[PDB]
Design a protein around this ligand. Sequence first.
Ligand code: Y39
Ligand code: FE
Ligand code: FE
Length: 221
Amino acid sequence: ALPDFTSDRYKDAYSRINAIVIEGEQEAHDNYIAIGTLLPDHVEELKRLAKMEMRHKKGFTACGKNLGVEADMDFAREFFAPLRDNFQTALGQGKTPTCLLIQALLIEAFAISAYHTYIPVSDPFARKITEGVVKDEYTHLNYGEAWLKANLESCREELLEANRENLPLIRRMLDQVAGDAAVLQMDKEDLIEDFLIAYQESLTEIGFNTREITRMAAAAL
Ligand SMILES: CCCCCCCCC[C@H]1C[C@@H]1C(=O)O
Ligand SMILES: [Fe+3]
Ligand SMILES: [Fe+3]
């Protein structure tokens, strides 16, 4: 069941998946620095999170180089454009809960699911890099959960709107990546399950009840 990492079929799918991961890590760095303009007293902690994202980007860049694959960066920029646009719109409006739901919850849960699914089918070099990134994703999810949990009473409606608008974009991103992910021997059903479990667990931690969460996860449709 392990893929042939040297085949043209594998390298072609990897060129797009690796580019999406590299672009995602760069946008994650940018997003935590941007949140620092909304939360000036959190700047040092956000800089630390942004620095971890740069370490992840460098590591995944090395994964692509190791397989002799040239990352399709243009494809990756277009892939993130819808979610990036919604983050920039919220940032410009000073909407911190929306920025945090997009980056610290949706994007981190998407990263956790993708990385957990990739690890058992990854090449030995990439496996170590991916394993060394997963602990940091939980740190980032925890940061977002902690702020939203402390501020839930003033941003309940905003979070429901942010979820309604952005959860379907994650669903569309999963649909667009499924073909290439299957070449990498990753099952779309495992990616969906792991993402929903991480996202539902974060919403539970924040303080949403079962009914609220069910209504929220249903927005994906
Ligand atoms: C098969 C799915 C692979 C594509 C999904 C990878 C998304 C990368 C998400 C990174 C930006 C998130 C982070 O570092 O917090
Ligand atoms: Fe990361
Ligand atoms: Fe992250």
